[PDB]
Amino acid sequence: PKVTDIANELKQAIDAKDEVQIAFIASEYSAESREKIAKAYVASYGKELPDDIKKALKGGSEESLLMDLFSDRHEVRAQHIRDALSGRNDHMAFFDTVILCTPEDWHETVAAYTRMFKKPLVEDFMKDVGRKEDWCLLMEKWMAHERVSRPGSPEDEAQRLDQAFDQKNTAYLIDFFGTVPSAEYRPIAEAFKAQNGKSIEQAIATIYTKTDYYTFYCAHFALLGMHRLAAYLINCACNDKGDEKRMRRITGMMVDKCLGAKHAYKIYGDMGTDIERCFDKRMAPILRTLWRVK
Numbered sequence: 001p002k003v004t005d006i007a008n009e010l011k012q013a014i015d016a017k018d019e020v021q022i023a024f025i026a027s028e029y030s031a032e033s034r035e036k037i038a039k040a041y042v043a044s045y046g047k048e049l050p051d052d053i054k055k056a057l058k059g060g061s062e063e064s065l066l067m068d069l070f071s072d073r074h075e076v077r078a079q080h081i082r083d084a085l086s087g088r089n090d091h092m093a094f095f096d097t098v099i100l101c102t103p104e105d106w107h108e109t110v111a112a113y114t115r116m117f118k119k120p121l122v123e124d125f126m127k128d129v130g131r132k133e134d135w136c137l138l139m140e141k142w143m144a145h146e147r148v149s150r151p152g153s154p155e156d157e158a159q160r161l162d163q164a165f166d167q168k169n170t171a172y173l174i175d176f177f178g179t180v181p182s183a184e185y186r187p188i189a190e191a192f193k194a195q196n197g198k199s200i201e202q203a204i205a206t207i208y209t210k211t212d213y214y215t216f217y218c219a220h221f222a223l224l225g226m227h228r229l230a231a232y233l234i235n236c237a238c239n240d241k242g243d244e245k246r247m248r249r250i251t252g253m254m255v256d257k258c259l260g261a262k263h264a265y266k267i268y269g270d271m272g273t274d275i276e277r278c279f280d281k282r283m284a285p286i287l288r289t290l291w292r293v294k
Contacts, residue, residue, distance in 0.1 A: 003040035010041060010049065014056045019066065019282070022053065023289040026069040030256040038070045061244040062283055068252030069290075074108040077101070077253050078116055081109070085128050091211050092236075094139065096249040098125075099218045100229050102257065103145040134170050134208070135215035141178030142219065148179045154187035155195065161188065162196045165203040173207075177219045185223035227260035234261060234275075234291075235268040242278035247287055255290050262293050 001009075006025065013021040026034060041049040050067040057063035068076045077097055084093035101109070113121035122143050129136045150157050164172040180188070193199040198206065204216045221229035233250055237243035250258075265271040272293035275284055288294050 003036045004044060006037050007041040007044050007049075010037070011045060011052075014052050017056050019057065019062060020285050020289055022066050023286045026066065027255070027290045027292065031073050034070055035072075041070075060282070061248045062286055065248040065252050065286065065290075068248065069255075072112070073253050074105065074112040075116065077105065077109040078112040078121070080249055080253070081113065081121065081125070082117060085124060089128055091214070092243075092246060093249060095214065095218045096233060096246060097253075098139055098142060099215075099222050100226060100233060100250060100254060100258075102226070105253075106143065106145055133212060134174055135211045137174045138178055138215055138219060141174060144178075146179060147181040150180060150184055150188075154184070154191040157184070157188045158192035158195060161192060161200070162203070165198075165207055168207060170207075173216070177216060177223070180223065182223045182225075189220075189224065225260070225264070226254070227258045228264045230254065230258035230261040231264040231268065231271075234265065234271065238274045238278040242280070242283070244279070244283060247279070247283070251287065251290050259292060262291060 006029075009025055010022065013025060029037065038049045041047075041052075045052070049070040053067050053070065054063060057066065080093060080097045084090035084097060098106075110121045113119070113124075117124075122140075125143070126136075126140060129139065131137055131140070152160070160172075161176060163169075164176070189200050192203075196203075200220055201217065204213065204220065208216055218229060218232070221232050230250060233246065237246040240246070262271045265274075268274070270293075271291065272288055275287050275291070275293070278284075279287060
């Protein structure tokens, strides 16, 4: 279908105030494609698509999410990061915005942040986070998105990694998780598991607790695959009594890139069923539509 025709579908769904229908249309198209659609929409009707959505819907995280899907995902992410820093540091939001992110999207987000707030994002972040804990240090290095191929084979690398865990050489840990390329991480994690008593995940649990723990744990999933981190962060939202704010962050920014989440979710259960239980009558059908698990 032509973008003008999709824009018309959206017009009528908005007029109908049909939330699931807006979610369904959004779910059909990637972030880039939804940008094209939003362009056709404003040309056709002379109003911005997120502005029309906001005016048509009641509100709550449902409307915000739907708006986000037809907004600039880098401005969206940048504002989430601002929000996470505006009060007490929002560590959950940190995971959603900093760790569940491709380097490309991060780069554009940093540019959006300068445009929106006339401040350097990373500087603002480290200002409020500090460097007194290992999670802070990993996040700083993560944001650099400077991945560096590792010297040895997967088995040699897993052994050095294991030795680092066993000796609590946290400096090696921060540098490893902060700079290892994802493509290399997967074979390393497999070799680790195969040769050592613990898997990498169990090793993390042995040395870290609280925010350190969750930061390295998210990093682990991220390196395995963004859809696998997505699966985990959706399960967390379900378990945290239907965390609407997290679901809005990760769905609004990342749903198109993480649609494999439903398959990776099988280790926790049935994603569709879990969303059904944990989220209310309005939000749940929206999420299940977007994540393609009706």
